[PDB]
Design a protein around this ligand. Structure first.
Ligand SMILES: Cc1nccn1C[C@H](C)O
Ligand SMILES: [Cl-]
Ligand SMILES: [Cl-]
Ligand SMILES: [Cl-]
Length: 163
């Protein structure tokens, strides 16, 4: 565990993280994909051996000794708001189980289903609150990665409001 488990946010490429493991915003087929998934594929391509897993689940594959947790959020183009909400919550619960199982002291996480799986909606608050519901019972240091300046401010505000 971390001595004083924390949440932080950084605005940069998650492929340059300073944590003990990474969560990939994966597709269900273990394909190189786009966005976070493509950056992860370029940095840790070995982690895509048998990484395919269903929506709402997480599957960890080692790149050397560095764990890549492939977490599959729903594509809100295909799911109803109700069913997508359930699968997005479930993917984060599976991330918390994997982080715990691995015994890491820190984890780099993106906001699942906020990019090309968002169905064209702003899901910062929805995705971040499912992240908190899952990760709050873990004692890893959690570092949330984003790319947008306004999202960085809103994520930082949400972290600070609870402290
Ligand atoms: C910044 C923003 N606006 C809508 C959605 N997002 C996040 C994705 C990842 O670009
Ligand atoms: Cl960067
Ligand atoms: Cl996405
Ligand atoms: Cl972002």
């Amino acid at each position: 565990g971390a001595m004083a488990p924390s949440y932080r946010v950084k605005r940069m490429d998650i492929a340059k993280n300073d944590e003990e493991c990474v969560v990939n915003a994966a597709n269900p087929r273990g394909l190189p994909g786009d966005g976070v998934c493509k950056a992860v594929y370029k940095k840790w391509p070995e982690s895509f051996k048998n990484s395919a897993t269903p929506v709402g689940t997480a599957k960890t594959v080692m790149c050397g000794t560095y764990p890549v947790i492939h977490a599959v959020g729903p594509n809100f183009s295909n799911y109803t708001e109700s069913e997508g909400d359930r699968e997005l919550a479930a993917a984060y619960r599976e991330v918390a189980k994997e982080v715990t199982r691995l015994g890491v002291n820190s984890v780099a996480i993106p906001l699942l289903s906020t990019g090309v799986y968002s169905g064209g909606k702003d899901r910062l608050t929805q995705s971040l609150n499912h992240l908190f519901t899952a990760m709050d019972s873990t004692d890893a240091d959690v570092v949330i990665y984003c790319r947008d300046k306004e999202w960085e401010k809103k994520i930082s505000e949400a972290i600070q409001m609870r402290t």
